[PDB]
Amino acid sequence: TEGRSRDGGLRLGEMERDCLIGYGASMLLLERLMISSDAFEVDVCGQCGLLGYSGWCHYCKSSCHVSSLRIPYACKLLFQELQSMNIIPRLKLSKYN
């Protein structure tokens, strides 16, 4: 949350992100803005590129291509809102290698 009376935390604004970019600390920025703030694990289907649940894709009615993925929760909210706006983001996953 925002306020101290609401038991809120501090906000790393845009300028803080700019400073962290200028320093080049990629892992620190990743830990601050992704790991410690809104980290979540979603299930993405490798066939249609949509978001699944509990390792299952309701769109394709299959679960062989569904894989887990780390993501900020705000990014998943943005993807859901865009899917609500008929702007469907199709995520093409691949191995980290």
Partner 1 sequence: FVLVEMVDTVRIPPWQFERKLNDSIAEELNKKLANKVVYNVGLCICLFDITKLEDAYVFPGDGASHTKVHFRCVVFHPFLDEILIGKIKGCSPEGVHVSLGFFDDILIPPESLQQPAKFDEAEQVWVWEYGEEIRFRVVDESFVDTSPYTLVGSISEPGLGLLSWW
Partner 2 sequence: GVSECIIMGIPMNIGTGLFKLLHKADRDPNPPKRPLIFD
Partner 3 sequence: ADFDGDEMNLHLPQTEEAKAEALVLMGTKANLVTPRNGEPLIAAIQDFLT
Binding residues for DNA: 4-5, 11
Tell me if 25 contacts partner 3 by CB under 8 A.
yes
From the list partner 2, partner 1, Zn ion, none, pick the one residue 71 interacts with, judged by a Cβ distance below 5 to 8 Å according to partner type: partner 2
Residues in binding site: 4-5, 11, 45, 48, 57, 60
Residues at the contact surface with partner 1, assessed by CB under 8 A = 26-27, 30, 53-56, 63-64, 95-97
Question: Rounded CA gap, 1 and 46, in Å?
Answer: 34
**Of 13, 65, 15, 22, nearest to 43 (Cα)?**
65
Q: Give yes or no for a contact between 70 and 40, defined as CB atoms under 8 angstroms apart.
A: yes
Which x/- pattern, by CB under 8 A, does the window 32-61 give for partner 2? -xx----x----------------------
